[model samples]
Structures are given as structure tokens and as C-alpha cells.
Target chain A: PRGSQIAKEFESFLLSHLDHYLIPAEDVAIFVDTHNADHVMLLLASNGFSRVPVITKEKKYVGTISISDIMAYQSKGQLTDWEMAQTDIVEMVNTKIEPINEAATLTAIMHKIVDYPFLPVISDQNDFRGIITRKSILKAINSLLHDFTDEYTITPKNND
Target chain B: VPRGSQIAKEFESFLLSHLDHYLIPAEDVAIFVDTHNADHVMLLLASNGFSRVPVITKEKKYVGTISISDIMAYQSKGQLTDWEMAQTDIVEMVNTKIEPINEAATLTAIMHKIVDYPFLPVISDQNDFRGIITRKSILKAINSLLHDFTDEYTITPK
Candidate 1:
């Protein structure tokens, strides 16, 4: 209940500060229905990204493209060597998945970051959203510090 | 005379020669204020696409280095929530600022400073912030240097 309430409050706060680039995008990255798992791996490797948004022919969000998904398919051993053949990068796009809203709180996004290095922020209308990288979250941390104090500290203990 | 051989040698030599220029810039470095949270530093690192960024004061003076690993450590401890972590002061989360260098300083001098540091921040005459110089940049310059040398040989036979 508290989490949902926090999410609602965050959504409102984000809405108040909407800018063009800051506003959520509608044309999100997606994989077509035809794409196989191999294609997804190649696309991710070439792009140097860990994940991508999967879309359909109508450009609707379907599923997500992640390294883990590709690994899962590879481990199944059901793919014939012929079927295992590399396909175009566009083929692996998931056409039936959904993405998190842009108005989601940092707390909600943090859960995603713990497992996924990057997340594609989407809109309620099923539009493509701007990417939020682990790096961006760190930047927010830096800005928050400025509002709090003027000194810096360091400790060697491992926590996270 | 081998094709790939020369490229490999050039790359190797560059790595060996420019080992020192890798450092975070002192002036533009972000310092963690005592009142801020871990998430605040995390946001800076995320936005800048940096694993480790120099921390500075509100006045933009040098402070320390806050890294992604640092935040993760704090999070694992359950000392603060992600949002609360962002608000936690960076004072306890940063590596103390090491030596700083001027932009016009010789790359060799800068390299020495880097040898002593994992990263160093660059500063202007007014102590204003400048960009960072990683060890990787020095390697890039070395690679370029070798290419120029090889090109000169092909042209003049000197």
C-alpha cells in the first residue's frame, strides 16, 4: 500500500517537471514478432547495451530484449543448427511486452537496476520511453548531495 | 613489414607509454557534501555515464571520488533506501582528492600524477573545473603518435 502510494506521489511530481527530452517518448525500441534469439544477442553486443525494448510491426511494445533471454534460448538446445543461423538484428524484437512508465519513482526504478543495467522508460499509451542507465541514477545521487552538505567522506567497508 | 604486426606493436607501445594520463579532473570533479545521500551520487554517475566521478563542493571545488561500487556497498548494508541513499551525504562515500594538475601542464607531468592516482581532475588557472584525463586517453594519443610516425616513414623514407 505504501509503495503504491509512493509511486502515485512520484508520478505527480514527475508530471510537474515535464520537458521535451524529459517527456516520455512514444516510439520506443522494439523487436518484431519474427526475430529469433540469436538476432537479439548480436544487436545487444553491437550496440554495447545489455537490453533493448521489443516492439511489433505496428511499433507496439511487445517484450524486452535481454542477454539473459538469449542465453535462455541457447540453453534449450531445441534450435536446429539451421534455425540457429544468424538473423537480421531487427528480428529478435519482442512485439508483445510492456515497459515501466516514465513517472515511476527512483525507488521503483532501482529494483529494475539491481537486475538490469538499463531500463527503457515507456508511457501508458504503449509508447517508447527514453532509456534510464545506471549512470543516470548515479548522477541523480550527485545532485541530491549538493542539496544536503559540503563535505565528502570515504569508507572501505563493502555493503552493497 | 607485417600488416597486423605493426598495428599490434603500436597498440602495445601506446599502452606502455601513456600509462599516467588517466585521472579525474579536479575542478569539475563532483564533491559529496555531508548532507547528501548515496542516490544523489548515483544519479551523477548515471547521467555522466561514469563508473567513478570526482566529487566537489557547491562552489565546485575538489573533494573526493564517489564510485558506483561505493553506492552498492551502502545499499547492501541496508543503511538507507535507494531514494534515501541518494540524500545521504557523500562525505563518507568518497575517496579523498589526490593531487591536481593544470591543463597546460605537460602530458608527462600529468602522467606522473596519474601514476600516483587511479584518476585525477584537471583544473584551470582560476581553479575552475576542466575535463578528466583517463589513462585510456594517453594510450589513444600514443596510438596516434605511432600512426603518424609510420606514415612519415612511408612518405619520406626517413
Candidate 2:
């Protein structure tokens, strides 16, 4: 196969196996309540993920929360007090990433993830699905390049 | 240029000039010293909003990296202690498995390493901490290169 054909095959492969690559919502850590800022902060701090999806008790996706959000809140010396009063801090926190639909195209996903480390995938009714991480995309691209080099090195083919 | 191989050569060349374009400079990065205690390093990681951070010596030479898991590993062993007289230094917990990449490393070298890391510490010839080359930066460069490549030739699928 030509290089361009290989590229197309890679693209088609990605499109066909899209859901297989996604990190499912059940496996992803999330913030279920806004009042539990302490727990939210703890999760973000303890886990390697810098950001996590925030969902309601009904599993409705609200917004994305980052460790930076908790940091900014803690800086104001109100995180603990807010937690004590059982007040929702989601209003105070800046949710930078808007959740994308589950049906979002690979192109759309790439564009969003270019600026944001991950994109929260949501259903049509805004139910939380999971996240698409930059790491996964990088790995996919890395695999494609590896295949290209491996195949082309053995037998040089003319351009299509 | 003949399709894939030609485009690949151009891709390598494109990456060479852009290596430092998106690097987070050393001065801008938050780092941990070999002398830092587990508690202190943990606080730094949380406050800086980073999962892992580069570790350096007193003289600013890049040594290795530290993560929350590293701290937890020590904590699990009941080794975490006060910073005043930290019984265990952070250097003892440092992860040296991922070596620091040279600032002048080739595109192939970086691509091979960066695939498995969130970010790689870049060091100078003298082993001074320069900065980190993040996966985000590499992806941005790749995105731009694809844009440039596609502008010249169309990939028509069969």
C-alpha cells in the first residue's frame, strides 16, 4: 500500500474503532457533588489526572473541574468553610472546558484536545460519558508512524 | 516529493526547527530539589497543578522526576517525615527510569520517548535543567505539520 493509502487506512481504522479507545465513564474518576470541595481537591491531588468530569447525582454532566480550580479557591481561604457550610463551589470555580457530544467527529475531538488536555464526552441529554485524552491520540498517531516506517523500510514503493 | 517517505522526510525537517517552539522554559517550570521532603514535595505538586515534576540537584542539574505515587510509596512504607529533619530525602524516592532527554536530541529520539511520557525533561550538554517538552507541545507541532502537509497535497482515499 502507498503511504497516502496507509494514512487513509489509519483514519478509517480510527473511525471504525472509535469507542474502543475511549476511557469509559465508570472507570473515570468524577465529582458527583459541588459541596464536597475537599473530596474533589483530594481526588485531583491524589490522582495523576489534572482534571476530572463533574456530574450531578442524576449523572448529568455539568462541567469539567481541574486542580487549578481547587487551588484558586483554596487561595481565597474559603474552601474549607464552603465545605463546612455544604455550599456548592462549582459556581465559584471556572469550568474552562465545555463538554462535547459523544458523537463528535475525530476532527472535532482533536481541535478541542489541542488546547485542553482532555474533553469530557456527553450524551445527547448531557449525560456524562467519559473523557478523550491527548495521550490516547498521541499513542494512535505514534502507532501509525511506526507502521508506516516498518512497512516502507522493507520495500520502497512509488508515490500513488 | 513521493508520497509517504518524502512527506516523512519533510516531517522530520519540520520538527527539527520547531523543537523548542512549545517547550515550557525551565525558569517557568516548578521543580523539586533533591533535599525536599515528601510532605514538601507533595505540597509543591498540588499547588503547582502538576501530577509529576522534574527533580534537580542544589546546583540546578536535572536529576530525575518525582510523582505522587513516589510519595505514596514512601508513605505506604511509613517513611514520610517532617521536613525539619526529613529522615528520607526526596532524591531517594526519585524515579530515574525515564532519563532526561538532551536539548539537541533528534526528532526520532524525542518521538520515541515522548510517546510513553506526559512530558520529558530537557537538559543541556552540561546537564543543566533547560525545560520540559510536553506531549501537548509535540501534538500541537504535529497538528501544525499536518496542516502544512495537507495544504500542498491531498490524501485521496481509495
Candidate 3:
């Protein structure tokens, strides 16, 4: 029987959080600059990327891309199994879906993470930053749990 | 020391309270058959956009799981060329990373494995396969709990 107050408090804290703890774009090697659909395809399959930022030749931020997004394009990639696999990878990536802004709050990030395994982040300066994935948040929670355990351990009370 | 620790213990215990409520039984899960070939499995993942999924036998015995991570790992070893991908069976590489959780364990109890593996399957008392749970699901649970604040009173600090 928990009150809605605690839930609200936690939500408030999360909504009011900072990006300081986030995995900064410069730190990881998992991002892909979308040149073609097959490029995104191989990255999704080989790099374990859930979503990646799509950028142009000038490194301009465009939009986000995902497996399901490409999965939607699998109809075209059907040529992979039957043909010489000459499908244009660039043609498959969607430039229609908008990228979630890096300035987005935890609440906004939370909502997107439910459906998209990762959300492409564009920094406040409009620079294409790294994407935030389900793994990053999970890793955050796991890190918090470790932080808690490192500071405290529960011991059983002696009972006669 | 005891007083300082009391709140942490209760909070931990409270986190565990909701564990039993979150169990998704095996009947509700989507699993891959153990004998499915690699190409078929990859297509299944591609079609569904599932990063990974549990594998089970017709007998419903929980076997293992496959994920993009495994695919990526295999690729690092030079396995994804059209040559190996077309002929390889998933069963050969399916046994490496699974660690099924006991169905009775709490969310806190399973958190470690949850962090280690993208998702962990739960097994019943008879070791029958139950549902698999993932870090995403746990986060969703937390999100839902937090959303309970809707319609609740708000206090604006002066």
C-alpha cells in the first residue's frame, strides 16, 4: 500500500535530473553516421546498436534510425537473400522520423525508451550527440544499485 | 549504525515487495525453437526487431537465448560473412550466455543478472520454462510506478 506521493517524488527527481551521468557521445565507439541502409543494417546486426544517429556528409544532425525502422524497409532488403545484394542502403534509412533532442528531460527520454531501444540525441547546440539506448539507462540503474551496495550492506540481527 | 541502516533495509525490502506481482509466466512469452537455423533466427529478430529472445524445446524446457550482442560477438570473430551465416545453425552458438532465474526470486534478487544479461528467463519449481524479463521491462515497471503520481496532490515550494 504505497502512496502516490513517493512515486511522484521519484518522478520529480528523475525529471529534474542532469545529463552529467549520461554516456556522453565522445566516450563510446558505438555510433554510426548513416551513409546507407546496409551501413545501418550491418551496424545493427554487428555493433548491437538499437538506434543510431543519422547525419549528413557535413556531420549535420538529421534524424534517428532504428532496426524496426529498417525492418520496415526489409521488403527492399529481400533482395539480400535472392539477388546480388545491390540494394541501395541510403534509400532504406528514413529521414522522416525526427530525432529526440539531447535537451530532452528524463521523462521524455523515458517515454521514448519504451518503444525505441535507443533515441538519437541532438545537443542543445544543435550538434549531433550520441544516442541514449536502453542499455545506457539499465547500466545507470545497475550502477546505482552498485553504488548503494558499496555504501551499505545489510546484516542479519542475532536472534536467540 | 543500526538506526542509519534501518531506512535502507526497509527501502530494499519495499523494492522487493512488488517482485512477485511482476512475474510474466512462460505461456505469455515468445520463444525460439532450439533447432531453428541461424538465418531463420536472424530473420525472426529482423522481422520483429527483437534484440534477443529465449530458446525453448517443444517440451517447454528453457534452453538459452540469442541476442544482437551474440551476433555482434560472432561477427567480431569473422563469422558473419555470407558463407558462414547461410550454413551455420543457431544451436551451435546458442548456449554461451544464458542464466535463467528462479521464478520465485524478487526484482532485487534478479537485478544483478538482469544487468549482466539483457534479459533473463525464469524457471518454475519443476524447472519448466517461465517468461523472460528484461532491463527494459524493469524500467517500464519503474516508469509505471512513477506515473501513479497522476491526480495526486502537488505542493509548490515557496
Candidate 4:
């Protein structure tokens, strides 16, 4: 199936089979490369999204940025003091992104989800991919109302 | 050179009393239950300009903390409808089993406990909620200390 068809199928699965938390909308926000860092920052500030993904011009995966990183930079005075008009959004984009393969299992993907609130999904070619989040996994696990599977057995090693 | 013998102690006592009276009331702190709904949580956070909040139970006992990062996970997965995402409940989606400290805890003790947390929920003997100690609070304290120490230094040449 094509991209649109794939998205439609995925949406159906999300709506029909998933719990409210496991649904795709609960996990991550996606963006194209055309987005500037300032726009991303504004989205994060106003919407409270901690993690977000950046895609390429072709809708391919590029990198990710988090509010923590931005705050860290701001706190350290790493950011320039120039006026908003003088700053470049491209310069604000964080290229140090971690990504996962689309074919990764829910369990394997959970590791990234637990560590980073938002993670980008990518193709084998390192192209733009969808995102997976801890909330999505929780939703998926919670949706299995009748199953006795061990997929939900993940536990934190330490309470801290 | 020995202008005053007990001035430092007197000033320190006054400063302590001022802090006790002027600081944000411990009761005004936010508390959350792990089961709280996402929408309500978001609204509280948005309204208060708080990125993180301490969670508690129906009994008012400390549980854990929740932040925008925790809530963003819901948005990324598309679990919340536009409407439901905006609503929050006390028992549905809050992070539970959080670390905590007693309400009578010293600033140093609270600071140690909050080394890893964005904020720590203060609790009472009955396990009831009290308030929160945040990194911002610590920084503010430090800022005041530095400002006061510098003024004192200016008055007494080294």
C-alpha cells in the first residue's frame, strides 16, 4: 500500500484497537524540515511538548530536539542575545538526534520511549519516519484488555 | 575593624524570619494523583506556568511528580482526542510512586532529595501534602545569599 493507505490503515488500528493512551496522538508530535527552530521552540513553549522530531525536505527523518536541550542552552547563555529578527531558526535546530527503525518491536522501542519522552521513527535509509512515545506504548499495553501477554511486564530497575 | 560582634547572627535571624513569612505558602503547592486525567493536568500546568508538579493521593499523601514531558507522551501517541487531552482526572494518568520528603525537612535535605527531580513534594506527618521545593527556589535562595554577602563585603574592605 502507498503512504496515504498505510496512514489510513494505521489510523483505523489506532482508533479501533488502541486504548485512549496507546493511541498515536498521545505519543509525539511530528514536523517537516521546513520548520525553523524558533517555530519549534514556540510550539514547545505554548504547547508544552518536551520532545519533537524534525524531518527532511522530502519528509525524511533528520533529527530531534527537546525542551531540556533548549533550556540547558538558555541557562548556560549558549544562546545569542540578538533580537528575534536577527536569529536564524536553522541555527537553533539540534542535529544530535537519536532514531529507531520502524520495524522495531514494541518492547525494543519501549527503551527509547522510557529514556526520551519523544523519539523519531525512521526508515532503513535513515529517512523521515514516524514517532513513538512512552504514552503510546502504555496505551498499547493498556488496550489489550483481555490478553495475558507479558508485553506489559516492563518494570523500572530502581524506584528512584 | 570590629564594628559589631553579634550583627551577623542578628541579621541571619531576621533574614530567616523574613523568608518564613514571605515564601510561597506550602499549602498553595500543587499535588497530583497518578490516576489524574491528562486534560486537567494540562490545564493546571498551563494556568500556573508550571512545567512540573508534585502528585499526591486522595488521602493527600505524596506520590510522585508529573511534568509536561510526561504529558507530551500522550500527545505524541495520539491517545488523547483534542477534547479528552484537555481534560484531567486525579486517577487516570499521573505518574505515581514518586520520591518524597517530610514537610519539616531542612532546605539542605530537600535539596539533596531534589537533586534528580525537577521538584519535590513536601508532606506532613499524616502523609498529607504540603508544598514543593523547586530548582528555581534553590536558585533564588542562592541569589539572595550572594547579594547579601556582596553587600556585606562592600561595607568591610578586605
Candidate 5:
């Protein structure tokens, strides 16, 4: 068990029996839909972001919205009904782009980021908190490895 | 350097040496032109399942990158119909960096830039579009390398 200290640290790091805070929602550009479609377009186009989280005026987490979602609607060629277009914006949200709970373990978060571009961090009460990005999480893990190397002399026996 | 850090450094260098293996060749990647209109660009991104992509000129010169947000943002300034009227060039909407890395880039260089982006477009010295190095492929390589390392060692809290 003497040489197992580094190994212990590595596993603990993944489990996030030791996770930290993520980028806050206010800091991250998000879509707060109050009325509907045109408003969504204004926010979506203003950010220079392809995708963003969608929340209501009440601040409850709904889902994410991508510009493609709106584009898909335009492709339908049914711009005749203004009311339908207005109602459709929130309906067009991609709920499949799942969010991670704020209490998620580091490994749990990593698994999500591996497939999705980012994971929205939400509260237990279903309140949108912030986001965890692929770049930030990967750097966290890499930094841990760097720290281990700086502090310890554990030999990588498989370094062949 | 500690043996642990030395191992990490060696592994990183090893990964960089075979960087080409992870490259998604430019010819295989879909690119948008500066001439494309908003609706056309929107459909392209939607169908491709890509959030953003590189933009190029008719001459195959790299210009910048575009995402749906760029088009939407452009649409915000005026009516969406303005795109049809003025036929705004996709290049006009690009606000992202036009820089691309060469194959000779250092491991440190690649790691830093790739962290901020999904992929980095690779270009030749003569400005020919070579390919892209994506974070997904980089992670895939890391997974394989670590799998070998873990197989040789017993890591346990016990």
C-alpha cells in the first residue's frame, strides 16, 4: 500500500469525491425565452454561439436550443401563421441535450462531455446553474496529472 | 523531472509524433463558402450535425469559421429576408479567428488551442488546407494509451 498513494489520488480525482465549481450561467451566454420566436432569434444571433441553454422568465431550466432548431422550422415553409411561429419556439427546444446535476462527480461529468459539447449544470430544484465545457474539464484532468508529476516520483513501469 | 512527470511528458510527445493519424483530412471535411446565404448555411450545419465549421473562399483559401449564431446574429440586425435581398456573404458574418496550425506545431501549442475549440484546422506553409485535428480524436488516443498503462499496473485504494 506504500506505493499506492498516487493511484489513490487518481481514482479519487475521477470520482469527484472532489469536484469544483463550473462556469456560472450568467457568465455563459444563455437563451431566456419570454415571448417566443423573434425574441429567440435576436438572442441566438447576438451571441455568436451555435447553441445555448434555454430557460423561462421564471428561471426554470427547460432545455437547450440550437440555431439549427429554428432553421428546421424555416425549412418547413409554414411562415403563414404568426401565432404558430410564436408558440413553436419553445416547443422547438432540444430536450435531448441533457444537463448534469451540479452535484455530479468528475467522472460522471467527463462521460457526458465526451459525447456532448458541453453539459449544463443544474440545481436539484431544476434551476439552471451554469455549464461545464470540454475544454475546461480536460484541462482539469491534465492539470491533476501535471501536479502529480510535480509532486511525486511514482515510476510509470509501462513507459516502454 | 520526477519520474511521474517524465512519464506524462513522454506520453504527450509520443502522441504528438503520430498526430497525422488523428487528423481528419480537409478534403473529407465539409466546408462552407463565403457566398452562401443564411438559410443555405443553416441547412448545411443542421444536416451535417456540426455546430460550427470552417469557411473558405472560392479559391480554396481559408477565411474563418461560422456557426448558426453568426447567421442568426446577422439576421438580428435586420429582417431575415435581408439575407435573400442583399445575399450577405458568409465571410461578412465571421467573427472567429482565421488562424490555422501547421503539422509541425508543438504538442503544447496543439493542446492549448484545441482546448478552446472542437477542432483546429491544419494548413500547410503555402496556405493549403491540410486537415483538422479534433479534440475527440485526441481524447480517443489518450484513452488507448492510458488503457495500456492501466493494464500494466494495479491501481486500487486497497
Candidate 6:
């Protein structure tokens, strides 16, 4: 069990499973504007992002802002002219998507956020920390499969 | 837990951190061709155990890309179109265009794009098709780091 590519097992278990993992990083440049959806739209695009997390100035996790959010805003015909850096995110984000914390498990991630490519991770009080990439999950699954295969292989014991 | 909902926080960032540090040059990546039809596309992706591959034109234009999602999406679209023709004519249904980034892109740029994408095609200064970077190698690098990380932690603790 130790040398079944112990090096590989080490990471597969630690980073992907154990709690020694670092907390989600902040400074992701979350948006705060809760009014004037136009202004928030511009600020969000300036970062060249297609989607972003939102937090109110009052430090509340509202949800996320996306391209669709902008589309939804347009459907209302409220601000069909004033674009960019005008309105806030209140009307532009979907407060339904949730975030996960450090104590979560792999089973939890796979079952949740199945459709999203990347997900937001949070810390104390659900503060947006950083992002969780789906590829990482794929990589871990591959590793887990490999480890199990290695464990089950017919490596004969020497007549020592 | 909801699918992908209960994932661990450490798992999330460790993945990000590994990608942030893992660097693979353009020349070493794997790729496929736009000329290959559906059969070829499926064969190529499966043989290589890849979920997706970058597509390019004969002129080396960094055109679009195809993934299992696209393949599955096409299959679900009534299965009327000869999917076997897909490898030969994958170009017809190419959507969700993924552009190639300059080989000189920063790690930040790479991670931002690569984490969500199965892989991204890297191009030289002349826009010549180089190779493709995937999550496989990055994960390997993470394993390496985990090994080293464990040693250091082991020493510090005992």
C-alpha cells in the first residue's frame, strides 16, 4: 500500500481528499454594485470575464453575474440604451447558485454544480474565496482509478 | 449532496494551485485535425483517452475545438446526422469556438482558460499550431508537488 506509487497516492489523497488543502483564495475581484445594473455590467466586462461572483457592499453573497443575466436585464427594456458602468448587480445576478467550504467531500462536488465548469468556494460565512475547476475533479478521478487498479493488480509476492 | 455540490474546499483550491504552477510549453501538447470526420474524431479522442481536442484548418488556422460534450450533444440531436460522418465533417457542427492563445500567455491566463476547458491549443508567434495542453499533465505535476509537500510536512511535524 505504501509504495503503490506512494508519491502519486500522496497527492491524490492529500490535496484531493485531506483538509491540509489551502482555503479558496480571495482578491478574485468580486463585484459589489447592487444598483444601476448598467454600471455593474461595464465593471464586470472590464475584467474580461464572462461570469463573476457578487457580494453586496454590505458584505452579502448575492449570487453570480453572467452573460445571461445581462440578457435578462435587456428583456426587461429598462435600460436598453445606457450601457456599461451604469447599473448594479442586483438585477444582473442569480442568487441561486451556492458555494462550498473546506470541509466538503468529492461526492458532494460531483453531485452538485454538475453543469458548471468551475464553481465558487467560500470561507467563514460563505465569503467567496477562489474557484473550483471541474478538470481538477476529472484528474482526481483518474488518479483514484489508477490507485485502485494498482492496488488490485496481480503483483506476485516473492517466496522471501 | 447535490452533484458537484459537496466538493471539499481544499480540493477546489489545490486543483487551482496545481494548475497555477503547472506549465507545459506549446510544442509538447497533443492535437487532432479538422479534416478528420466523426469516425476519426471519436477514435482520436478515445484512443488518446482525451475528452476533447483542438481543431485546425489546413492553412493552420486556429479554428475551433470539439469535446465529448459536443459529440454527445450531436448524438442527442435526434441522431439523424450520420455521426460516423462526424470525424470526416466535424467542421460542419463546430460550435463553442475556443481560440488559441499565444504560447507566451501567462500562467494566470492559462489557468483561467484551462481549468474549465478540457484543454486549450497553444500557438506560436506566427499563429502556427503548436500543441495542446491538457489537465492530465497538470495533474501529474500536482502529484509531484503533493509528494514533495508531504515530505516537508512529515519532517516539520515529527
* lDDT, candidates in the order shown: 0.49, 0.69, 0.60, 0.51, 0.66, 0.55
Model 1 stretches with alpha carbons more than 4 Å out: A1-30, A86-98, A110-112, A147-160, B1-158
User: Which of 3 and 6 is the better model by TM-score?
Assistant: 3
Residue-level lDDT of model 4, residues B34-137, one tens digit each, is 66777667656655545667777767766666776566665666666767765655344456545666766644344344445555666777777777665445
Q: Highest lDDT: which candidate? A: 2
Candidate 3, residues B58-133, lDDT tens digits: the string is: 7898878876556556656774786677687666668546668887765556665765676778888776887877
Model 1, B57-155: lDDT tens digits are: 667665666765666565666756666665578777666646667777754354445434545677778766565765445433433432332332221
Q: Please give, as one word, the docking class of candidate 3.
A: acceptable
Residue-wise lDDT of candidate 5 within A1-160, one digit each (tens)? 3311223445454445234327877787767655466567555656656578888777778888866676666657665446545664676787887888877755455556767777888888888888887767656656544554454444445647
Better of 3 and 5 by lDDT: 5
Give a tens-digit lDDT track for model 3, residues A87-119.
Answer: 444555556545678667566676667666666
Compared with the real two-chain complex, what DockQ does model 3 have? 0.25
Question: Which interface RMSD values do the candidates have, in the order shown?
Answer: 24.8, 6.7, 9.4, 25.2, 5.4, 15.0
Model 2: residues with Cα > 4 Å off, grouped in runs: A1-21, A66-68, A74-94, A148-160, B1-7, B17-28, B36-41, B72-76, B79-89, B103-106, B124-126, B152-158
Choose the strongest candidate by DockQ: 5
DockQ of all predictions against the true structure, Cα-based: 0.02, 0.25, 0.25, 0.03, 0.33, 0.07
* Local error of candidate 6 at residue B104 (angstroms): 25
Q: What ordering of candidates by lDDT runs from best to worst?
A: 2, 5, 3, 6, 4, 1
lDDT of 4 by residue, A1-160 (tens): 6211212222333345434423232244665555544556557755655456766666666666555544445545555544332443444456764777767644344334545554566678876546654444434423331221122221113224
| Per-candidate clashes, comma-separated | 74, 0, 4, 40, 2, 31
Listed per model, the TM-scores of chain A against the true chain A are 0.57, 0.73, 0.55, 0.59, 0.76, 0.61
| Descending-TM-score candidate ranking | 5, 2, 3, 6, 4, 1
Q: For model 2 chain A, where is the 10-residue window of minimal lDDT?
A: A149-158
- Against the native chain B, each candidate's TM-score is 0.55, 0.79, 0.67, 0.59, 0.78, 0.57
Candidate 5, residue B28: CA error in Å?
Answer: 3.3
- Lowest-sum lDDT 10-residue window in model 5 chain A: A1-10
Clashing residue pairs for model 3:
A36-A89, A36-A90, A37-A89, A37-A90
Which residue segments of model 4 deviate by more than 4 Å? A1-28, A31-34, A74-84, A95-97, A149-160, B1-51, B55-158
